[PDB]
Symmetry: C2
Subunit: 328 residues, 2 copies
């Protein structure tokens, strides 16, 4: 009786949201990258389910939450490992090959990229524009691997992969460089939480923009088994800190998340860049010695600001509230 | 495109439903409870001739009960008048509450899935004096040994939300009480054997109110294979007019739709009574006994008035447009 999926909650409002997104894209004449004027500043949060009763939560969780990927990322200690910060939850995402965009769109707007607006914007940048600095940063990162098994064509195909052409799934899968291009279209950092953190895990900064022109709260995604999902903040979950840690525990120490595609001079000042493009806070967490506390960096996460008029989750919630009363 | 109408805006459906029980007025002097404002709303369906057949097909599988539409048209019971706007049958859940689902959709574009209408029928039957309803029903029953009290008790029991199909099926007297709860006539177009070779079909008037206190456009339902659906008017330009005939063809003559549960004096002045509660017009039709045309009575049907704010069909339409432009 609930909606089997989120979008089913108000199919009309979804269409409207989607229809607003192309119009918010500004397309510079002079080669500066096309970018969103306003909508990149939106953030969705998930509503609390604990005040409901078990058979009801199940309905909701089955309907909304990717429980397989949540359990995977949690058991490998990459997701929600830190007791001090608010819980993040994975939302179901279509796994058609366009899931990088479906998850990113959902994180901001509560809809997936089914009209291909984000997908087309990515391809657009990598074909209609020249992309010299992108290719360079990609070469630099590729050559960091201590070994090369014996690449003239590799860049051209990466551009082809971003196309909406059919490959296997409906769309070609995307890779790290596409995430970095995407964060520059959004003027917003993307942080990807995964097991290897094919190395998609880590931090993507909109370096083709001065931080002054960017939104300083990240989009947070989860990645496992070739699949992206958004990892959204669970609402009213104080007193825990609204932030995502910029390190993980690894073999008894804290290890920094990878920052992708930096030049040598940028890499030398990685901490300074992180502090410009995110809101970095230094928080205490328990040590391996129960008698020690450690300070680590974390980045503030945004508060829910997606208005009702364009929020499928609020409508989902009222559906839930109307239904719960019938169950009580 | 969504597979059913309500999947088009689940949030709005709930809003609509949440308004209904608050619109009911419960009197303390014994007068039946009834709707204050929402009984006046009427839904119209949008046209799909502006689309290509493959698309038409998807809209029609989603919205239209084509089985019942085809059955009633093939008997010349539905859409047989050349002068008049087409009516279309919408899909309705067949769970034993379909009388209420179809009535609710006709006015409000949502089904009775909170049981508001069903509960209001059972409430009137169980918790007020129903002496007049019973008397009228006895007269219709008589027009083997009968036990009136046992049978009346059973009809009240059928109205409940008790599982017996998820719910008990309802019959004529329930439609009669319902139209008095809505203060609005209900006209049922039903499947019926050819006279040459049923009883639910006909006109139910809110005779427990003066006509001046009732809405004077009817609710129109179809009935076949024990199932009710709303028959809503199709939006259109001119020149054809919005109406529903009040008689059926019967070979070379016409047969008046049954007017249910009348007392004998009322039945004597039936045409007068129909003109009080409905807007009765005369429409010329081609004759089947000799004679180019004959005038038959028909009732005017309402224009669409269900504001967008509470219209799932508008939202459905806007989805059709978006999804269409893409192809
Ligand atoms: Cl911790
Ligand atoms: Cl450890
Ligand atoms: Cl320690």
């Amino acid at each position: 009786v609930l909606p089997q999926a989120l979008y089913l909650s108000n199919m009309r409002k979804a269409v409207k949201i989607r229809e607003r997104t192309p119009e918010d894209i500004f397309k510079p004449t002079n080669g500066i990258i096309h970018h969103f004027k306003t909508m990149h500043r939106y953030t969705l949060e998930m509503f609390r389910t604990c005040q409901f009763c078990p058979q009801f939560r199940e309905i909701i969780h089955k309907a909304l939450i990717d429980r397989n990927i949540q359990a995977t990322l949690e058991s490998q200690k990459k997701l929600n490992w830190c007791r001090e910060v608010r819980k993040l939850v994975a939302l179901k995402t279509n796994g058609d090959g366009n899931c990088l965009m479906h998850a990113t769109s959902q994180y901001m707007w509560s809809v997936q990229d089914t009209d291909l607006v984000l997908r087309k914007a990515l391809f657009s940048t990598l074909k209609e524009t020249d992309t010299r600095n992108f290719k360079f940063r990609w070469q630099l990162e590729s050559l960091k691997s201590q070994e090369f098994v014996e690449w003239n064509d590799e860049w051209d195909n990466l551009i082809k992969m971003a196309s909406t052409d059919t490959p296997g799934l409906q769309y070609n899968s995307l890779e790290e460089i596409h995430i970095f291009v995407l964060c520059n279209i959004l003027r917003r950092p993307i942080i990807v939480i995964s097991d290897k953190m094919l190395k998609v895990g880590g931090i993507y900064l909109p370096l083709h923009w001065p931080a002054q022109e960017c939104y300083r709260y990240p989009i947070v995604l989860g990645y496992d088994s070739h699949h992206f999902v958004p990892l959204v903040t669970l609402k009213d979950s104080g007193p825990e800190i609204r932030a995502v840690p910029l390190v993980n525990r690894d073999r008894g120490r804290f290890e920094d998340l990878k920052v992708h595609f930096l030049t040598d001079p940028e890499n030398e000042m990685k901490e300074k860049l992180l502090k410009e493009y995110l809101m970095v806070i230094e928080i205490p967490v328990q040590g391996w010695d129960h008698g020690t506390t450690h300070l680590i960096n974390a980045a503030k996460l945004d508060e829910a600001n997606l208005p009702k008029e364009i929020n499928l989750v609020d409508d989902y919630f009222e559906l839930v509230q109307h239904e719960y009363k019938k169950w009580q």
